[PDB]
Design an enzyme around this catalytic site. Structure first.
Site, mmCIF file in Angstrom:
data_model
loop_
_atom_site.group_PDB
_atom_site.id
_atom_site.type_symbol
_atom_site.label_atom_id
_atom_site.label_comp_id
_atom_site.label_asym_id
_atom_site.label_seq_id
_atom_site.Cartn_x
_atom_site.Cartn_y
_atom_site.Cartn_z
ATOM 1 N N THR F 1 -3.638 6.446 8.853
ATOM 2 C CA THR F 1 -4.411 5.455 9.589
ATOM 3 C C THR F 1 -5.089 6.077 10.798
ATOM 4 O OG1 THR F 1 -3.014 3.578 8.933
ATOM 5 C CG2 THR F 1 -4.325 3.339 10.941
ATOM 6 N N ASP F 17 -10.631 3.330 10.018
ATOM 7 C CA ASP F 17 -10.778 3.784 8.647
ATOM 8 C C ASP F 17 -10.181 2.750 7.697
ATOM 9 O OD1 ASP F 17 -8.063 4.012 8.893
ATOM 10 O OD2 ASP F 17 -7.958 6.071 8.152
ATOM 11 N N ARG F 19 -7.673 2.772 4.598
ATOM 12 C CA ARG F 19 -6.699 3.259 3.629
ATOM 13 C C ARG F 19 -5.320 2.805 4.068
ATOM 14 N NH1 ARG F 19 -6.369 9.562 2.237
ATOM 15 N NH2 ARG F 19 -7.970 8.813 0.785
ATOM 16 N N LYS F 33 -8.723 -2.963 8.630
ATOM 17 C CA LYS F 33 -7.857 -2.625 9.750
ATOM 18 C C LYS F 33 -8.358 -3.144 11.087
ATOM 19 C CE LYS F 33 -6.070 1.590 7.672
ATOM 20 N NZ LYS F 33 -6.306 3.042 7.831
ATOM 21 N N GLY F 47 0.018 1.635 11.931
ATOM 22 C CA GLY F 47 1.455 1.591 11.756
ATOM 23 C C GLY F 47 1.849 0.746 10.566
ATOM 24 N N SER F 129 -2.433 7.928 12.780
ATOM 25 C CA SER F 129 -2.074 9.305 12.463
ATOM 26 C C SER F 129 -3.169 10.273 12.894
ATOM 27 C CB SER F 129 -1.792 9.442 10.968
ATOM 28 O OG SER F 129 -2.995 9.511 10.227
ATOM 29 N N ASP F 166 -7.085 14.349 8.681
ATOM 30 C CA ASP F 166 -5.779 13.703 8.673
ATOM 31 C C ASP F 166 -5.520 13.103 7.301
ATOM 32 O OD1 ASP F 166 -4.036 11.234 8.779
ATOM 33 O OD2 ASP F 166 -3.648 12.015 10.786
ATOM 34 N N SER F 169 -5.713 9.008 5.958
ATOM 35 C CA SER F 169 -6.814 8.317 6.606
ATOM 36 C C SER F 169 -7.783 7.787 5.558
ATOM 37 C CB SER F 169 -7.533 9.241 7.590
ATOM 38 O OG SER F 169 -6.864 9.262 8.838
#
Lengths: 50, 139, 258, 316, 233, 221, 241
Positions: F1, F17, F19, F33, F47, F129, F166, F169
């Site tokens: 994330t 993002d 996912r 999100k 999270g 992340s 990352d 993501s």
């Protein structure tokens, strides 16, 4: 008493129009005028009960 | 005994208005604020009552009330009741009579030997606003 | 004076408040139910049918308690709503526990136990609502029950609660076939008794609601008859009454000839 | 319908300035047919028909309204739904409102009623029959007016359009008043009022009812106070609607004031807030009559009558 | 009458009346006129906001209040009880939204508010809500207008009036209301029904009106109400 | 994330993002999100997906009831305090790390709320992340009082850096540009990556599978 | 109808709450009166101050309280009830600032207090405490605001109001003064309030037998005017009237 009042009120309708004459319309209007019901006004108080 | 005595009064009235001793040329008129609480026997659409309604004055009837009340009174020429009738309200005939009396009293108290539109305006406001000073959470 | 509380015994042993609720049920709109070996059915009158009212809900007195049960309510609206929700909750709690529909007698017993608790405990007025339950369970098939404000219930072949219930039940007693009544005859009898008990001019179709529960393909179906079907039943009943009156007139003419 | 609206505006400018070009353009637009799927060209055509009738009325070309009806009756017969009668009603009203007597009104209205009966448009037929009754009364064929009105109201007592029932009962009362059968006129008026106090009465209908009630009260009971009250209500309604039947209500109020033996109020009422737009010979006639009555002069009264013969006389 | 059985809410009178809830309904009927009309493509609510003086700032306390983007509510009766009920209705709508990610249906909101009123009309130490609510929503593709009474009974209405002159309002609505009425005409009908029971001059800022169409419930601004009053007059 | 937010001249721009990974396999490709709190307040969630989703839903409901009661637009301070107090009452088990951003009467406000209930009001924030990469981009290419388009570009580039550096993501980049006038909700703002054009042809013809029973039920109309 | 009178929760057969009405009568029982008026950019509350003893500390005697830094109230009615409701208002304002992070709007605090009072009016646990609270503050988007929180849950907002024995007279006077150029300045508003009290009470005020609290847009902190300021207002405005 309601029927006698019906006859009397039809006669009064005839009297109004300088008449000595009673017709079916006169009796029907007399019936309407004499059997006038004061049903409940408020829908809430009317609908308390299912 | 008290409720029973009141019912006794009503029963005597029913008796005397229509009973074994049918009256001759004795008419009756009864005035009331509401006919819904009336006893069905007394309200009997027979030899006991014929029902008539005295509603609050319409606009046309209000015009007539003003004209009748003011005929005996004399006013100016710019004091048209012709719009005080049109102003919406629920004033009754007693209210209109009170309005006219109060406007006349206003004029006589303030000398000013005429009755004018300002006098009628003040009296009308007073009478219409008299129905106030209640509690405001009730509404 | 022995009626200031629901939990007070009269010196004769009578709960005057419970009796008051039972009598007050008489204000409710006439509901009735007939049991037929083909199915079961309820009928009910619309007390108030003002033209400015909307018809948002498909039924005002007849509720569907679960798949296999329906009930007509007669009494105070708030109490009726409370008890309908509680009946649905009881049925679905039983279904969650046992994984099979609650039998009709068990559901009636549960709600009537709630009513009894209300009549017995503390400062709580008894539920001023009577109920007519119709249902189908694997044990006794089609069943019809009636339940009072006091939490007393009985099983009936045909019954009526609400307004003019005495006249309606007397008429059913006269004209109900104890074991040879089908659903069509039950509907005809329901229309007859409603016409003779409503005592308001002709039987306006918009002033009556009828529901029928029947087994079909192994599944219970509860159908609130559409206004078209109700009108057709009323028209057939009116034709039957007119035919009977014509027969009586012909008999009178024959008697005049004699 | 942008192009259609542009055509309408061009036709409107030509109506204002060069009426014949507008007439030809609207004739072509009415001749135009309408796609069955498109429900807006239909509105264009109906508006064009209405504006063509407007052109005819404005120019005094009231001879073509028969053809208009003849070639607009074979229509889709689905304008809006159960309210297409409004267009034809307005068309016929404007046609009969001709400022010059073309001489063909009764039979044209009769063939309209016959066409409505054939087409089975019952409500439009009832409207046409009411219009025909009013036309009979206007042309003073009182007996035929009463016959048709009695038939129409007998039909109407048992179905909808209680507004039309009220109008027909009012016309019955008015024809009785014209025929001097005052008790029957009052009976019809009372029936009309009883029916009217059960439905919405537009300002025009309420004004008509009030004026007829005032007329009958003046005629029969000799309570000119109540007659004046009803006449004022009619005047106010017709003033709100800005109808031309408000000078008559003003004239009748002044007449009631005169007959109440208080002609001093005639001037005070003519010098009122609402009695100013109608100033003219109409109010001057009754001001002069009130002055003559105040002076109690028979010579002055006759002088006023002869001077204002148009206003005081010829209005029964 | 049954005089003894009129001070408690947990006792049936010998005839079966629950007199105290009828007294609550009397308190309702002795309130400011409010009108609700269910147009063909929307709903309209109106109610007189006449103040007892010029000093009352008639822009602070509103009488026609939203409960969701698609539900609104007016009342006839006591203002404090109304405030309580509107707060509870908002809370119930939010709970329904959290549970079901979907705006609460108008019928369901009415059911739950009626349940709240029932909760308040089932004990001796609590006073029944002395108000009647008129809820107007646009659930699904059709409009809904409901009434909720102190007794916990809820109705579906075509059009109604409540308050001081509800009888005259209902007669007027019987005369004027037709089912296939557009919202724009229903607003005029609502304001006229108010006028028929509104003393004094119905100025734009002493009347409160809220519409409910497919765009969601919205209280009309005083400028819009002024425009409607001018067009009507 | 990966989520980020930057306060530009007129208002704020949030960018997340798309996912959600169940372990180390992409479970969702288009997870939303950027959650709604009020017409002028949006918060990007990172999270535990369920925790952040239900937390934002509850706070949005509370703030909407608050706005209905008051009669005026809600305040980002109000939303931030509600979220902070809830996440603190829960000692850290609500793994919902949020980037709150809104535009109330008192200009634009951007907060970074952490799972334990510690909030940092900041001009620009990044979380998730990929928060480290997003903050790298922000530090390298952030300036005071940037224009709306420049802020959108900056936040989009930060989220793209998070995507590309990352694991876990998103695929698409979602944006939310809030100001005193506009409430643009760009969904998706960009598609940096897309599944490679399906190169196969594998649809199996009828009858390939072996059936045993059928219970075709003719549903009523 | 006197049976439906001893319980706050019983409706009269015509739907009236006699105990709530009696709470209002209790408002009209402290003898004092209070007035409040809002100008363009200020709000003013003025209360009659009775200190009928030389031994009574006039500093402690008061009816103006600072609910928060930017909200003030004048209380009229029973003193114990007034102070209890003042503490409740302070607590509610503190809770609002804690939960939502910004100062409580005056209208919101009035709604909270009115709801608290409505709860007592509905349930039968307490008596409706018989005090009337007039709140004044400066709202950043609306401007000066004056509100009432009568003991039945009614809290309408006001251009100018009064409470206590002479509320009707003060209301009539303020109606007349507000029909003509309601737009008042700071000095004009203080003039109007003080003049309303003086005329309704039929007395001219010493600088001490009156207490004034003020909020202004320039200085939106509830300030209780000192004796010097009160005397300056009285003398200057009486002279230049």
């Amino acid at each position: 008493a309601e029927v006698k009042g019906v006859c009397t009120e039809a006669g009064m309708y005839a009297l109004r129009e300088r008449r000595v004459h009673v017709t079916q319309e006169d009796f029907e209007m007399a019936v309407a005028k004499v059997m006038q019901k004061d049903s409940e006004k408020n829908m809430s108080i009317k609908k308390l009960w299912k | 005994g008290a409720d029973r005595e009141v019912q006794r009064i009503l029963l005597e009235l029913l008796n005397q208005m229509d009973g074994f001793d049918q009256n001759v040329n004795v008419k009756v008129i009864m005035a009331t604020n509401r006919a819904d609480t009336l006893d069905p026997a007394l309200l009997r659409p027979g030899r006991l009552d014929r029902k008539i309604e005295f509603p609050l004055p319409d606009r046309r009837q209000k015009r007539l009330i003003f004209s009748t009340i003011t005929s005996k009174m004399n006013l100016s020429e710019e004091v048209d009741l012709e719009d005080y009738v049109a102003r919406p309200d629920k004033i009754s005939g007693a209210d209109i009579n009170s309005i006219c009396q109060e406007s006349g009293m206003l004029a006589v108290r303030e000398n000013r030997y005429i009755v004018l539109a300002k006098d009628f305006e003040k009296a009308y406001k007073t009478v219409i606003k008299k129905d106030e000073q209640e509690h405001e959470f009730y509404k | 004076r022995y009626d200031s509380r629901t939990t007070i015994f009269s010196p004769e042993g009578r709960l005057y408040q419970v009796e008051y609720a039972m009598e007050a049920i008489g204000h409710a709109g006439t509901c009735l139910g007939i049991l037929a070996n083909d199915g079961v059915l309820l009928a009910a009158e619309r007390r108030n049918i003002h033209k400015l009212l909307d018809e948002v809900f498909f039924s005002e007195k007849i509720y569907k308690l679960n798949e296999d049960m329906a009930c007509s309510v007669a009494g105070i609206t708030s109490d009726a709503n409370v008890l309908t929700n509680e009946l649905r909750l009881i049925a679905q709690r039983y279904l969650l526990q046992y994984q099979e529909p609650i039998p009709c007698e068990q559901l009636v017993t549960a709600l009537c136990d709630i009513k009894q608790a209300y009549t017995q405990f503390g400062g709580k007025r008894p539920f001023g609502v009577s109920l007519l339950y119709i249902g189908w369970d694997k044990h006794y098939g089609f069943q019809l029950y009636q339940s009072d404000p006091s939490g007393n219930y009985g099983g009936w072949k045909a019954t009526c609660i609400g307004n003019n219930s005495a006249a309606a039940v007397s008429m059913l007693k006269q004209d109900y076939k104890e074991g040879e009544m089908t659903l069509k005859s039950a509907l005809a009898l329901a229309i007859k008794v409603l016409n003779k008990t409503m005592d308001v001019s002709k039987l306006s179709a918009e002033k009556v609601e009828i529901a029928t529960l029947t087994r079909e393909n192994g599944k219970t179906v509860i159908r609130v008859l559409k206004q078209k079907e109700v009108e057709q039943l009323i028209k057939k009943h009116e034709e039957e009454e007119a035919k009977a009156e014509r027969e009586k007139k012909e008999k009178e003419q024959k008697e005049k000839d004699k | 319908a942008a192009a259609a609206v542009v055509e309408f505006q061009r036709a409107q400018s030509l109506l204002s300035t060069d009426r014949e070009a507008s007439i030809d353009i609207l004739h072509s637009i009415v001749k135009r047919d309408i796609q069955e799927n498109d429900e807006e060209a239909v509105q264009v055509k109906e508006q064009s028909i209405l504006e063509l009738g407007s052109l005819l009325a404005k120019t005094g070309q009231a001879a073509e309204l028969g053809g208009l009806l003849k070639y607009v009756r074979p229509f889709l017969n689905s304008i809006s739904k159960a309210k297409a009668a409004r267009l034809v009603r307005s068309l016929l009203d404007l046609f009969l409102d001709m400022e010059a007597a073309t001489g063909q009104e009764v039979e044209l209205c009769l063939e309209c009623i016959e066409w409505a009966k054939s087409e089975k448009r019952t409500f439009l037929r009832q409207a046409l029959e009411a219009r025909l009754v009013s036309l009979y009364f206007d042309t003073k064929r009182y007996q035929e007016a009463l016959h048709l009105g009695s038939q129409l109201l007998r039909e109407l007592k048992k179905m909808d359009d209680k507004a039309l029932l009220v109008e027909v009962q009012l016309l019955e009362s008015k024809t009785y008043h014209a025929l001097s059968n005052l008790p029957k006129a009052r009976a019809a008026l009372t029936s009309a009022r009883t029916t009217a106090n059960a439905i919405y009465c537009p300002p025009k209908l309420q004004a008509t009812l009030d004026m007829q009630s005032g007329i009958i009260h003046a005629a029969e009971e000799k309570d000119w106070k109540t007659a004046y009250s009803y006449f004022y209500e009619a005047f106010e309604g017709y003033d709100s609607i800005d109808s031309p039947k408000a000078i008559t209500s003003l004239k009748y109020m002044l007449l009631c004031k005169i007959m109440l033996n208080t002609p001093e109020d005639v001037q005070a009422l003519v010098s009122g807030k609402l009695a100013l737009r109608y100033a003219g010979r109409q109010t001057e006639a009754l001001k002069c009559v009130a002055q003559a009555s105040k002076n109690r002069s028979l010579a002055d009264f006759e002088k006023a009558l002869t001077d204002y013969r148009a206003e005081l006389r010829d209005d029964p | 009458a049954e005089r003894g059985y009129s001070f408690s809410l947990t006792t049936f009178s010998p005839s079966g009346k629950l007199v105290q809830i009828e007294y609550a309904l009397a308190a309702v009927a002795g309130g400011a006129p409010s009108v609700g009309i269910k147009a063909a493509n929307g709903v309209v609510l109106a109610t007189e906001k006449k103040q007892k003086s010029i000093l009352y700032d008639e822009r602070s306390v509103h009488k026609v209040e939203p409960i969701t983007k698609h539900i609104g509510l007016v009342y006839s009766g006591m203002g404090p009880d109304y405030r309580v009920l509107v707060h509870r209705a908002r809370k119930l709508a939010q709970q329904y939204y959290l549970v079901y990610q979907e705006p609460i249906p108008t019928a369901q909101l009415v059911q739950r508010v009626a349940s709240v009123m029932q909760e308040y009309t089932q004990s001796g130490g609590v006073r029944p809500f002395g108000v009647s609510l008129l809820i107007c929503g646009w659930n699904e593709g059709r409009p809904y207008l409901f009434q909720s009474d102190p007794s916990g009974a809820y109705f579906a209405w075509k059009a109604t009036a409540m308050g001081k002159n509800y009888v005259n309002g209902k007669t007027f609505l019987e005369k004027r209301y037709n089912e296939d009425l557009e919202l724009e005409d229903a607003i005029h009908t609502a304001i006229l029904t108010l006028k028929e029971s509104f003393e004094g001059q119905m100025t734009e800022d002493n009347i409160e009106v809220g519409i409910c169409n497919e765009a969601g419930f919205r209280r009309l601004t005083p400028t819009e109400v002024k425009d409607y009053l001018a067009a009507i007059a | 994330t990966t989520i980020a937010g930057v306060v530009y001249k007129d208002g704020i721009v949030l960018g997340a993002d798309t996912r959600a990974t169940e372990g180390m396999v992409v479970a969702d490709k288009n997870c939303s999100k950027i959650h709604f709190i009020s017409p002028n307040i949006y918060c990007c969630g990172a999270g535990t997906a369920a925790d952040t989703d239900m937390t934002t839903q509850l706070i949005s409901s509370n703030l909407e009831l608050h706005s209905l009661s008051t009669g005026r637009l809600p305040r980002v301070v109000t939303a931030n305090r509600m979220l902070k107090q809830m996440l603190f009452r829960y000692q850290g088990y609500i793994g919902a790390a949020l980037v709150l951003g809104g535009v109330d009467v008192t200009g634009p406000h951007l907060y970074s709320i952490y799972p334990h209930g510690s909030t940092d009001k900041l001009p620009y924030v990044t979380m998730g992340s990929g928060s480290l990469a997003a903050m790298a981009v922000f530090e390298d290419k952030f300036r005071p009082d940037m224009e709306e388009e420049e802020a959108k570009n900056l936040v989009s580039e930060a989220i793209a850096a998070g995507i590309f550096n990352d694991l876990g993501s998103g695929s698409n980049i979602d944006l939310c540009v809030i100001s005193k006038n506009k409430l643009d909700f760009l969904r998706p703002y960009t598609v940096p990556n897309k599944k490679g054009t399906r190169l196969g042809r594998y649809r199996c013809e009828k009858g390939t599978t072996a059936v045993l029973t059928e219970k075709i039920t003719p549903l009523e109309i | 109808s006197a049976g439906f009178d001893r319980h706050i929760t019983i409706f009269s057969p015509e739907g009236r709450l006699y105990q709530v009405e009696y709470a209002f009568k209790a408002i009209n029982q402290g003898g004092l009166t209070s007035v409040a008026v809002r100008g363009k950019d200020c709000a003013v509350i003025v209360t009659q101050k009775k200190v009928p003893d030389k031994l009574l500390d006039s500093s402690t005697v008061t009816h103006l309280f600072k609910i928060t830094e930017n909200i003030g109230c004048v209380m009229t009615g029973m003193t114990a009830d007034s102070r209890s409701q003042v503490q409740r208002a302070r607590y509610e304002a503190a809770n609002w600032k804690y939960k939502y992070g910004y100062e409580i709007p005056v209208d919101m605090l009035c709604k909270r207090i009115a709801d608290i009072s409505q709860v007592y009016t509905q349930n039968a646990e307490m008596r409706p405490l018989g005090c009337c609270m007039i709140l004044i503050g400066i709202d950043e988007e609306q401007g000066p605001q004056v509100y009432k929180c009568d003991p039945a849950g009614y809290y309408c907002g006001f251009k100018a109001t009064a409470a206590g024995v002479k509320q009707t007279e003060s209301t009539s006077f303020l109606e007349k003064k507000v029909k003509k150029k309601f737009d008042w300045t700071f000095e004009q508003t203080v003039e109007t309030a003080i003049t309303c009290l003086s005329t309704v009470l039929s007395i001219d005020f010493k600088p001490s037998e009156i207490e004034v609290g003020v909020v202004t847009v320039e200085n939106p902190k509830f300030r209780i005017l000192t004796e010097a300021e009160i005397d300056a207002h009285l003398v200057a405005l009486a002279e230049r009237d």
